[PDB]
A paper describes a structure:
Prokaryotic type III CRISPR–Cas systems provide immunity against viruses and plasmids using CRISPR-associated Rossman fold (CARF) protein effectors. We studied WP_013033759 (hereafter named Cam1) from the halophilic Gram-negative chromatiaceae Nitrosococcus halophilus Nc4, which contains a CARF domain fused to a transmembrane domain that does not seem to be capable of degrading nucleic acids, as is the case for all the previously characterized CARF effectors. N. halophilus Cam1 (hereafter NhCam1) has a molecular mass of 22.3 kDa and contains 206 amino acids, with an N-terminal transmembrane helix (TMH) predicted to be 24 amino acids in length by deepTMHMM26 followed by an equally short linker (L1) and a C-terminal intracellular CARF domain. Here we investigated the structure and function of Cam1, a CARF effector that lacks a nuclease domain, but contains a TMH domain that promotes the formation of a tetrameric pore that is required to provide immunity through membrane depolarization and growth arrest of the infected cell (Supplementary Discussion).
We found that cA4 binds to the CARF domain of NhCam1 with a dissociation constant (Kd) of 12 nM and a stoichiometry of one ligand per CARF domain dimer (n = 0.5), whereas no binding is observed on addition of cA6, cA2 or cA3. By contrast, the 2.1 Å X-ray structure of NhCam1-CARF bound to cA4 shows that it adopts a dimeric fold with no domain swap between the monomers. Loop L2 adopts different conformations in each monomer of the NhCam1-CARF dimer in the complex, with the N and C termini being in close proximity in one monomer but far apart in the other monomer, owing to crystal packing forces. The bound cA4 is positioned over a platform generated from both monomers, and is further capped by a pair of L2 loops, thereby encapsulating the ligand. The bound cA4 complex is stabilized by hydrogen-bond interactions between N1 nitrogens of A2 and A4 and the Thr97 side chains of the CARF domain, hydrogen-bond interactions involving the backbone phosphates of bound cA4, as well as hydrophobic contacts between the adenosine rings and non-polar side chains of the CARF domain. The overall topology, hydrogen-bonding and hydrophobic interactions involving second messenger binding in NhCam1 show similarities with cA4-bound TsCard13, but not with TsCsm65 or SiCsx14. Alanine substitutions of amino acids involved in hydrogen bonds with cA4—T97A, S75A/N76A and Y180A/T183A—reduced ligand affinity from 17 nM to 3.74 µM, 4.0 µM and 4.5 µM, respectively. Triple alanine substitutions of amino acids involved in hydrophobic contacts with the ligand—K160A/F185A/L189A and V79A/P192A/M194A—resulted in a complete absence of ligand binding, and a reduction of binding affinity to 2.1 µM, respectively. Analysis of single alanine mutants showed that K160, F185 and L189 are all essential for NhCam1 function in vivo, and are therefore presumably important for cA4 binding during the type III-A immune response.
Residue numbers in the entry:
A (entry chain A): 52 to 206
B (entry chain B): 54 to 206
The structure:
Amino acid sequence: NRFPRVGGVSESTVQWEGVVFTVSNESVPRWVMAQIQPAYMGLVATQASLAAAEAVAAVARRRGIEVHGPLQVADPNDPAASRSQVALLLSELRRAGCREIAVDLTGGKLPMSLGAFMAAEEAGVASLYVATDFDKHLKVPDMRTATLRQISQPE
Amino acid sequence: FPRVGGVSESTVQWEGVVFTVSNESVPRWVMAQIQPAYMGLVATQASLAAAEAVAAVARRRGIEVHGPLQVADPNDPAASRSQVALLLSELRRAGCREIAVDLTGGKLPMSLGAFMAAEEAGVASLYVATDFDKHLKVPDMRTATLRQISQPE
RNA sequence: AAAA
């Protein structure tokens, strides 16, 4: 694809046994999946992004990842609703044996990312972010500049 | 310390509002609804022209504008926390009694550092929520509402 | 994904 083949800023950034996503599009989580190569995955989506989350899930299961979800949030503008569902996925992954989890909060609306961040921080799990440079008018990310970054390490 | 809650629209005419800035359209819409007396702006080298456009309009309405202050690294929440925290202090010291932070604009880590600075200062966080087209890529500004992300205690 |  037009994402770089290599994306992690550092070796620790790509070492995770599980990853939980807030989902808006299927492209970015699919790329992060290929960067990290986890054994487990969780997905939080909305009614509007459900189809894209189900496509990330189908891809991941085919490669043998244990995928929990997608779970839906009733309201993507409510960070509490996303915190609840991310916290449930974090707990499900742990009861399934996943020893080290990070939450990629790039996707979804901003309150979804904020709920995910709070759930991650309260659970002692790191948060990841795909950073890109943009066009002049800051409306479109350049996939070819993507880098995966850790923005918290509260473990 | 402010608690992160549900869906309620923010209905306070905040005396001061601090923005993280990416585009000029959304802050201008916020400023038109809230009509604050004070405004702070946090931008980047890339979003500076937009932030200065917001500032020019606000100043011509009589609003006291602090900033734009620039973040060196928009991918790093701590750089944005620091500048938002500076502007919160600046507005309070300039006489502003009730402040909110609108974290809609900027990259996600700029919003996240803004949020942390708002939580630390005990002030509310706001978000402009809109509905999008079917592919979730173009927001429809006609549907904009101002949401209160957190509730200061 | 600098307003999913």
